[PDB]
Structures are given as structure tokens and as C-alpha cells.
Structure 1
Amino acid sequence: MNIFEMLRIDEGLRLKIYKDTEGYYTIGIGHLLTKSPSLNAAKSELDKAIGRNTNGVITKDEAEKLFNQDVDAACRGILRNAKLKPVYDSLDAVRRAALINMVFQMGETGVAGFTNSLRMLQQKRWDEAAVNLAKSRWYNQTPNRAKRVITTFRTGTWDAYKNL
């Protein structure tokens, strides 16, 4: 298991633009299109991202390039963020994917706002980190997905993703 298959389980694959759990237009493997409530804005952003007249539908191949682009962006965002990099530096490979999962979902700025949870993780206080992570908007908006990521942080294993 790796960050790519982890996120594929968490995000799924949908070929036509859909509304995420927060009401924002998204497509592919968790690719946020826009925060605007206009569907045409989403199709225009989708057109801009794919470079063709999409009409709200993307191929499976285009979704995987968007996926690779977004994973690359999430990694670069972590490495260039002054508060995310030292925590990422200290984590093992399994927990590094969990942090990238967070940034992939809610962006670099949002994850950096977990001031208490990030200090927990860097000090390898997993149990306490899990408790603090569950007390967030993230946890009650996407509980099933957040529980899997939090379990990954707590145990350092892929057990939350076994048989999924």
C-alpha cells in the first residue's frame, strides 16, 4: 500500500463532475474544480485543466494525470511549508502517506492549521495525536475517511485499508 492506492480508495473514481461532501464541484480522483456555486464555473475550470471541451465528463486516463498532478502538488506543498516539512521529516513511510492524504484533501494551508496535532505527530505521541485529530471540522464532515487516516497515524499500519 502506498499514497497512490491509499488515495484511490479514499477518493474513488467518478467520470462526470460531482459535488463533494462540502458542496464543492470535484471530479476524477478527488480533484477540486472550484469553490464557486456555479456549475459552469466548474466546467470552465475543468475545461481549463484538461484543455478541451469536456462538457462535464473526463476520461479515466485524464483523471489519472490529474491525480498525478495533484499528488505532486500535495508533496511539494508539504516540503515548502515551514510547519509541514519538519513533521513530515520525522514520520515513517506509512504516516507520511497519511499526512499527504490530509493535504490532498483540504490543501496545504488547512493542514498547517492543525497546530496541536502536528506537534503531537512530530513527538511521536500517536494516541494523543489521534485524539486531537478527531476534534476538528475534518472529522465530523468526512468521518469514515478521517477515521481511516487517523488510524494510520495511530498505528503506523495500513490496517484501516485492509480488504477495502
Structure 2
Amino acid sequence: MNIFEMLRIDEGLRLKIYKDTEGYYTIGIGHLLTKSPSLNAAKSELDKAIGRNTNGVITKDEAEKLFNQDVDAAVRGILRNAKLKPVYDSLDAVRRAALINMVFQMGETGVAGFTNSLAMLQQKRWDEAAVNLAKSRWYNQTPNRAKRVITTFRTGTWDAYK
């Protein structure tokens, strides 16, 4: 198991524009297009991202390519983030994947705000961090996914994903 497989399980894969759990236009493997309520605005962001007149449909390869860029960006955003970097540097490989998942979902800014959970993770207080991570809108809105990431941080294994 690895980050790609992990997120592929959490996000799924859709070849046409769809709305995410927040009602935002998305495509592929969780690639947000726009937070705007306009389908056209989403179609426009889509063609801009792929580099062709898509008409709101992409292929599998195109989706995978958006995915690769998105995962790379997340890692790189973590590394440039003063609050995130040290946590990531402190963790083992499995757990690093859980932090990446969260950043991919919520953005760097969103994650850097889990101040308290961040500190606990950094100190390797697994059970306490899991409890703290759960008192969040994130957990209340997407409980199953959140539970999987939380267990990953708690255990350091991929069990939640097998």
C-alpha cells in the first residue's frame, strides 16, 4: 500500500465532472476544480488544467496525471510549510502518508490549524492525537474517511485500508 493507492481508495475515480461531499465541482481522483457554483466556470478550469477542449470529460490517463501533480504538490506544500514540515520529518513512513492524505483533502492551511493534534503527533502520543483529531468538523462530515486516516495515525499500519 502507498499514498497513491490510499488516496485512490479515499477519493475514487470519476471521469466526468461531479460534485464533491461539500458540493464543489471536481473531477478524476479528487481534483477540485472550483468552489464556484457555475458548471461553466468548472468546465473552463478543467480545459485549462488538461490543455484541451474537454467538454467536462477526461480520460483515465488525464485523471492520473492530475493525480500525480496533486500528490506532488501536497508533499511539496508540506515541506515548505513551517508548521507542517517538522511534524512530517518526525513521522514514520506510514504515518507520513496519513498527513499527506489530510493535506490533499483539506489543504495545507486547513491542516496547519490542527495545532493541537500536530503537537501530539510530533510527540508520538498516538492515542491522544486520535482523540483530538476526532473533535473536528472534518471527522463529523466525513467520518469513514476520517476514521481511516485516524487509525493510520493511531497504529502506524495500513490496516484501515485492507
TM range (shorter): over 0.9
Count of aligned pairs between the two proteins? 162
Distance (whole Å) between structure 2 residues aligned to residue 4 and residue 30 of structure 1: 12
Q: In the alignment, which residue of structure 2 is the partner of 1:62?
A: 62
What is the CA–CA distance in structure 2 between the aligned matches of 1:44 and 1:141, rounded to whole Å? 29
Q: Distance in 1 between matches of 2:142 and 2:34?
A: 19
Partner residue, 2:117: 117
1:141 Cα deviation (Å)? 1.1
Question: Shift in Å at residue 140 of structure 1?
Answer: 1.0
Aligned counterparts of 1:125 and 1:38: Cα–Cα separation in 2: 44
Partner in structure 2 of residue 12 of structure 1: 12
Aligned-partner Cα distance in 2 for 1:123–1:137: 23
Could you list the runs of 5+ residues in structure 1 that have no partner in the other structure? none
Tell me how far apart the structure 2 counterparts of residues 141 and 72 of structure 1 sit (CA, whole Å).
26
Aligned to 2:147: 147
Deviations 1:26-84 (A, max 9, x none): 11001010011111111100010001111111100000000000000000000000000
* 1:72 matched to 2:72: yes
**Alignment root-mean-square deviation, CA:** 0.5
Q: Alpha-carbon deviation of 1:15?
A: 0.4
Question: Secondary structure in 1 aligned to 2:69?
Answer: helix
Q: TM-score, normalised by structure 2?
A: 0.99
Runs of 4+ in 1 over 2 A off after TM superposition: none
TM-score, scaled relative to structure 1: 0.98
C-alpha separation in 2, matches of 1:123 and 1:133: 14
Q: 1:31 maps to what in 2?
A: 31
Deviation of the 1:100 alpha carbon: 0.2
Give the percent of matched residue pairs that are identical in Structure 1 and Structure 2: 99
Residue 132 of structure 2 aligns to a residue whose secondary structure is: helix
- Classify the secondary structure of the residue corresponding to 2:18: strand
Secondary structure of the structure 2 residue equivalent to 1:32: strand
Q: Take 2:114 and 2:39, find their aligned partners in 1: how far apart are those partners?
A: 31
State the SS of the aligned residue for 1:135: coil
Q: Displacement, 1:102?
A: 0.3
| SS at 1:18 equivalent | strand
CA distance in 2, matches of 1:26, 1:124: 35
